């Protein structure tokens, strides 16, 4: 019921600022929040924050000073921008909207590309995703886990799978509800530091990258991720 798109430049040089839309699109919305994530080369991705349905926004203490969200209801759209960029903010930048009161389901955007040619002070909860790379075979019983560097609440920790040219698909949430368009072969555990994702029977199609992630403390952080491969 919801579309979201990324625009802006594609290269910025360091200094300036940079602006990015999202042209927000399809149902209308009583709630909610609309985030900014970016996702760096080697596909680390990062939470920068948000602006709620009632003009809220909450940044990441890493980038406080740089960033402002901001809305314009009357063009259904949502902004972001960041000042002092430097070659460290290379990413591919993503809109996403998400429903606090429907756990079930985000929307993502396209995401786009921007390559570039202070204070805050903060803490954040680590997740570590081990193997990074793994290949099974057909048929397979696949594991993946993800161990939390404190513990979480196991209604906020969510996976995602997200293929080459795409965006993160919502994938589980609430420890272990799988989300619309999921097969039933995949499942979900855990508890306090140690969650795991398990795939029953692997078929072609379930290789991907797949990120835990957590919202149950602020930032909102994301795993190192787990490639996940076919074999032959
Ligand atoms: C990343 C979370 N799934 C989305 C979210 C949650 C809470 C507030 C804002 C946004």
């Known amino acids: 019921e919801v579309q979201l798109q990324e625009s802006g430049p594609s290269l910025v040089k360091p200094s300036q600022t940079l602006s990015l839309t999202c042209s927000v699109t399809g149902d209308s919305v009583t709630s909610g929040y609309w985030s900014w994530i970016r996702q760096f080369p080697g596909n680390k991705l990062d939470y920068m924050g948000y602006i709620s349905y009632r003009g809220s926004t909450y940044y990441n203490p890493s980038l406080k000073s740089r960033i402002s969200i901001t809305r314009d209801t009357s063009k259904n759209q949502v902004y972001l921008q960041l000042k002092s960029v430097s070659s460290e903010d290379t990413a591919t930048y993503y809109c996403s909207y998400f429903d606090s009161d429907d756990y079930a389901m985000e929307y993502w955007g396209q995401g786009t590309s921007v390559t570039v040619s202070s204070g805050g002070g903060g803490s954040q909860i680590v997740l570590t995703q081990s193997p990074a790379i793994m290949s099974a075979s057909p048929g397979e019983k696949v594991t993946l886990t993800c161990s939390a560097s404190?513990?979480?609440?196991?209604?906020?920790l969510y996976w995602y799978q997200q293929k080459p040219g795409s965006s993160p698909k919502l994938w589980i949430y609430?420890?272990?509800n799988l989300a619309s368009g999921v097969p039933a072969r995949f499942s979900g555990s855990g508890s306090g530091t140690s969650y795991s994702l398990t795939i029953s029977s692997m078929e072609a199609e379930d290789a991907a990258s797949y990120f835990c992630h957590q919202w149950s403390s602020f930032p909102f952080t994301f795993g190192s991720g787990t490639k996940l491969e076919i074999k032959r």
């Open positions: 404190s513990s979480v609440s196991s209604s906020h």
């Open positions: 609430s420890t272990s």
